[PDB]
Write an enzyme that holds these catalytic residues in place. Structure first.
Site, short mmCIF file in Angstrom:
data_model
loop_
_atom_site.label_atom_id
_atom_site.label_comp_id
_atom_site.label_asym_id
_atom_site.label_seq_id
_atom_site.Cartn_x
_atom_site.Cartn_y
_atom_site.Cartn_z
N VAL F 48 25.54 -31.89 -15.00
CA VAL F 48 24.53 -30.27 -14.58
C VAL F 48 23.43 -31.70 -16.10
CG1 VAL F 48 24.45 -28.95 -14.62
CG2 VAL F 48 26.43 -28.99 -14.27
N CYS F 49 22.22 -31.01 -15.24
CA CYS F 49 20.95 -31.69 -16.02
C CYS F 49 20.74 -30.86 -17.53
CB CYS F 49 20.12 -31.89 -15.31
SG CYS F 49 19.84 -33.57 -14.81
N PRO F 50 20.56 -31.90 -18.74
CA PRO F 50 19.95 -31.34 -19.50
C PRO F 50 18.53 -30.30 -20.14
CG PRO F 50 19.82 -33.38 -20.43
CD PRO F 50 20.39 -33.11 -18.66
N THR F 51 18.12 -29.97 -18.85
CA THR F 51 17.08 -29.48 -19.11
C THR F 51 16.74 -28.84 -19.80
OG1 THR F 51 17.78 -27.70 -16.90
CG2 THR F 51 16.28 -29.94 -16.76
#
Ligand SMILES: *Cc1c(C*)[n+]([O-])c2ccccc2[n+]1[O-]
Ligand SMILES: *Cc1c(C*)[n+]([O-])c2ccccc2[n+]1[O-]
Lengths: 170, 172, 171, 171, 172, 170, 171, 172, 171, 172
Positions: F48-51
């Protein structure tokens, strides 16, 4: 620590003693139903005479008359006791003894009655009165130089026996 | 909690109010150094039982004073209670004139220290102690409630202690 | 040390007392279903005349009228009490006592209620009110020089009796 | 838990209060040389009208006449007090208060005096009298449903004031 | 003494009296199983400081109810104190009509359990907690006294938690 | 046990971090006189991205404008941090980071701030605001699935800065 | 806090996630009953220093498999960190293809249990342990950080243990 | 009693009697300050198993001396037992001539400190420890009784430490 | 409660009254510095069993004196009991003339310190101890009650200790 | 660790490997129930001092066997050390053939239990203990290292116990 308390059951004891020139076993339960006078003395073969200790033996018929047992005790052995008994009163001995003389070599009885001189391992001149139900009724403890009166002991026991039947009257 | 009374050791220190000569006085054990002291306890003030035992020590006090011995009576009753009983004549069952101090241990402290306290009642047993000039406890006598003590015996003991203090013990 | 708390069961007591000139046993449970007023006093045979103690005895018909028991207590003996009762009021005695006078030679009741002056072995001038269900409702402790008012005691009990049945007030 | 004892120094307190409509600091030491009457109450904004609290405020000239300070206290905030003071007495408020009203949101003063009902975080109806030398002289604690009498409080203080100077009584 | 509030663990249980709809009601955490709960603290009743922060949660409660979320306000003031402030109109600096329950923690117990108690004052910090349907604590927010909290952020969090409860987290 | 308390001095920390592609030492005392925002994240190289973490780096000029330091932290190493920084944002990496990324491999900083998930040895999504005098002013802790708003953090810091100079006003 | 690894005693039990063949798998010690296990620790993922010594165990695993021996690599990095380093080419200082499982101990638990944790850094020392088929620890090797371990030595030890299991002492 | 041996920490201190060059001598760890020290343990004297593992360290000592390295052998047998075994020819299952000191640990102290003591037998496991010039422990090797140690491995390790002491910062 | 006698350690220090040459004397261990001491315990005075084994040490003391060795007899009987048994003729089962001092341990202290006290009887077991000139305990001998000790053996031991003090080991 | 050896109490229990008739065997105290047992300790194997004291007990064992008495020798050396010393001829300072078992106490357990262990060296003092058929300790003899024990004395003691077991009530 001492286990002797007024109104509470007297500290239980069992040891060898000398009575009529023989080694016998003596327990507190053996004297159930009777009044018991247990008295301590320091040492066997002291140079100052045991006139006080003798006095309790000589006047035992008076105690027997009132159905009262008299027990002598020290931290000397039964062998030491018998020897001093075998020593004539002429040579500062006990002679014939009409009361049992208890041996407290383990210091247990002295400790339980709280009459032990710790730094010497000998008993102070204590005297205790125990009723028929095994309850401690009187405590007397004297410093070494002063002995005990037979008359006083008789006065106490008879006073206790009277107050047992009568309560508090003249 | 624990008794502090031991033979050969210094007698338990006490400091309390008392009744002497119809006045409230302060009493300390230090007040009696260089003198023999007889401290005796009794259970209750205003008892229906004959106080003749307590009175006997007061009546025969001249014998104690002659031997340079101080006598002290004590109970867990108040210093006011002591005075009222002293003010009651012997005809009505009072103490009358007391030639000795009557100590008030409402504190329970002295009874505790001499181990004569009947805990469940908060009263003292009939104990009697002999203390030497040096403040050393010499003799313990504790009686159950029904039996009183003898003045003659107390005198016999104190005289014996005084004799053995200077002399050594002797047989013949 | 103290066992006395508001809204909690009042400390249980059982001792000998003097009532109507005789020695009787007094237990707390004996006054179940009644309001109890237990008050302490320091000493028997004080030079101060015991006017405050006498007032609770004399005005006891008012307390009885409200079905309320009144008990006096000190660390003096039952024998000491009886002697002070037998002493006439003109000679600084109690005279006739219409309430029981409890003997706390134990110090047990004083200790339990926390009114004991330890250094003296006497009780402070405390007063306690206990409900029919044996619950403590009121605590009053005074320093020795100052006594208590019967009028206040009656006001308090009547206030408690009213609020037991009703609860809330218009003024 | 409790620090309050008769004949011992009264528990020290310092908190914010409302007096004459302003927030002020109240310390116990501020009333050295005066007799102090500290009384507790449970809650601000009760449906029960606060007639007992009001009576101590209205009759304060009598207390001032005897050089005696009177302090009210509860576990409510100083903001809560001021709001209840600003509420008219006809609408079940306090109105004008002529004595300081202490805020014990700390629970510290209640805990120290041992009047705290732990399970509720409110103080029982306690009243305490402290002498000019800061020694506690009188303890009064009432269960919640029953209030206190100004007449008794005055009788007590005057009895203490008299016995401080004289000590003993003829009746 | 100790805070009982932990992320991932069951939220500290509370049971207290509260004011809802002008009545005193009993409030328990068990009353909210199968529902998301937002519990927020405030310092004092009748503050001169604008209560607009507390009011905002009441005013915008229809947004919370729409998401099936219960909102609870709390302070260490009394349940009587709550009602009096609610009865005060917003024109005079009151709370006015409250669409949410206002809990009374005079006990100090809930503040202690959530570790939001300012000990030296006996008031609660501006803490706000999010508890899931299972009674699991999900979010902790504690603010120092001067700074209030945002309703929008609280809504952003609760919606995010509900979405992640059924779905897994997703990047694009 | 946690050492973080509102109104009390913020738990002191010293560790290595990655800033501008280099290993540097970072202490709390280094940011005396400034507001500090310390935020934790669980893991490097999550799918899951570190947006959210990126968002704080991209919008740092806004924080710098208000004289506010932003510090990122996890229980991964400085070597792990730099690698994820070297990974392009196209392949789910961090790319260029304008904020320092702290390594808490000893778990000391997480423990002190009480954001450690013990059974996993990773940090919950915590965010802390510390004033110029080194006093902790704000605590925010999120469960793992939910990230944090930059707008909210900016709102908080500016509110704290305003209330520092002004007290309590509109 | 306390090491559990003792020679002649049951090897400390462990259960964690790991990377094997590019997938997250669960690894337990109980999985390797009836077989020799070589568990070895390394400090950090994405270390600038050549991981070739670690790589050598993976490359020469055919020799370990030939002897029916399981090889396990472990560190206090995450399971995600392991996979990323695995996906990094060996030309760019990565792990590349790994024939052996690489265990994640972000717990610090396994390092602690084997007493190879460097407390101040939260990283594992270069430890290597040999466990027999019955699950009893037979050999302890711990190296300081800068110095790696020999695959030949590990092989020499394990086959010596296997030989002595069935023979004893050929003098 | 537990282990005192930790990597990075100062190696456990020891002082005992030993047999070097056919004589009894006193051995201290402090004696080798400024040198790398290899200390290895063995179970028993006069075992039916060939002491070839022990012999190998004695024979190849000139390699260790070349690298300025001391090599110390140890067991829980006496010095009298050591000398007896050294005086036994290698043809008759003895040690023969020894280029290294053989330490006696009859009081079990050194084994305990290094955590190599098998309690139920009072014998040492086949442990090997590497200590640097500053007296810091650098390497722990413990083998179960049936498996011996390699000289080549010991030599590989020693040189790796000496190289990394001079440079460090390795890229193998 | 706890024994203090240890081989190679300073012998437990003792000080008590004793009978020597028919007089009460004080005996300390410090009195015998620069000399070998043999301290031996016996159970009881006026025992029906022959004390001849004890007597033998007194009779053969010239041999001990010849070697510059001090012999001390001890029991938990009194100093008065000792003298009485000494004054009892050997024909009548007494001690007669004693060439060695006979120590009184009614204290139980010395027996306890040497760990030879039979607790349940408050008597000492037949223990024998050898102390060197520097005051260090060299030999412990404890026999059960029914079995006595050999003077020849005591002599064999002490002169062996004296020889090894100056020579070491003549092989 | 302290001593478990008391007179009149059951002798401390032991179980170890020993060397009897040139073989390794298991020895227990329970093995000699119904017999008198003499257990003696010695410091070290392969001492330069003649083991003549130890030898004397082996040579004169038929005297002990005649009295139905077991004799056990012990030290903190190994069984491998014992067998090595037994195999050494008496002409070369060995033990030679041994009629008695020689117990190995390498774990220091039996020495500790009998309180004969010299801690700082891990060797046993020259102790000798006599145990009866019921397994009750009857005699304690501890010598410092330089002084040996007499067989005649041991024999005198054993027979005295056997006689007093049968009769008691002695008049020597
Ligand atoms: C009392 C007594 C004592 C103790 N002793 O020994 C003797 C000896 C000789 C004559 C008289 C005598 N008394 O009377
Ligand atoms: C947010 C994200 C992430 C994490 N990853 O991996 C990818 C990969 C490929 C395209 C887009 C993308 N996004 O957006």
């Amino acid at each position: 620590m001492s286990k002797a308390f007024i109104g509470k059951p007297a500290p239980d004891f069992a040891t060898k003693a000398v009575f009529d020139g023989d080694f016998v076993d003596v327990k507190l339960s053996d004297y159930k139903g009777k009044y018991v006078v247990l008295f301590f003395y320091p040492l066997d073969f002291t140079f100052v005479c045991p006139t006080e200790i003798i006095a309790f033996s000589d006047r035992f018929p008076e105690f027997k008359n009132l159905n009262v047992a008299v027990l002598a005790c020290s931290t000397d052995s039964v062998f030491s006791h018998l020897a001093w008994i075998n020593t004539p009163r002429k040579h500062g001995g006990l002679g014939d003894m009409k009361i049992p003389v208890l041996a407290d070599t383990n210091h247990q009885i002295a400790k339980d009655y709280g009459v032990l001189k710790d730094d010497e391992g000998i008993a102070y001149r204590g005297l205790f009165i125990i009723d028929p139900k095994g309850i401690l009724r009187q405590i007397t403890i004297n410093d070494l130089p002063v002995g005990r009166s037979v008359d006083e002991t008789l006065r106490l026991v008879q006073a206790f026996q009277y107050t047992d039947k009568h309560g508090e009257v003249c």
